[PDB]
Design a protein around this ligand. Sequence first.
Ligand code: HEM
Length: 212
Amino acid sequence: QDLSEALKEATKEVHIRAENSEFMRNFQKGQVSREGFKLVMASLYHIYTALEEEIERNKQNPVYAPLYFPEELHRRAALEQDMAFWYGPHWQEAIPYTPATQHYVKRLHEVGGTHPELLVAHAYTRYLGDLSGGQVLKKIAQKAMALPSSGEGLAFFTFPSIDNPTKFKQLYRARMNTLEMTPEVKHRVTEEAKTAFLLNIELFEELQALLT
Ligand code: HEM
């Protein structure tokens, strides 16, 4: 079985649970507010910064190299633009760094520095989601908060270097399937993907508590 299919099958259950977290449930209903949106986007800024720092550290490592697509996928630059939009010129000293966000970042650094063969699980969890349901979330946010079609405030959800997300997603999956795989690695990669989803659920649960 291809790694791309194994990951989808391994995370379809936790994905349903993630969609139904209180925060995401409210988001989908279009009940997302500026306060809550700023919290999630600031948290993602920290998460993608860590993820991409680890991707750079392992770009030449065969256990990840086939998935090195910084021009097309990396989100740090986009999040920096969004932070300036939502938090202003001095966003760097204004954005929050929640405990759940810190925990996620911690695991990313452990994986990138000690278990790089599992980094693909984290890239899969974040990037393939961004190219999929992330586009649905983008539309909901635009409608709920009156964000312009021009993209301001939603750079994170925009991929100017990718003509068609569906096509790129198929390419990314194909390259994922070229990674040298063994039962050992496949087993652990799918397990780490479930952990990545849980880290996201825990973040959402925390943000919801901060909002309520
Ligand atoms: C607000 C709740 C969410 C909505 C509306 C949503 C919706 C979707 C949709 C419509 C797809 C495409 C399904 C398909 O092609 O069969 C998808 C796939 C995906 N989502 Fe989400 N999603 C949500 C939250 C999340 C979260 C929290 C994560 C984890 C960061 C996530 C990660 C993924 C991944 C990795 C994929 C790609 C699956 C694959 O093709 O292998 N999603 N999502």
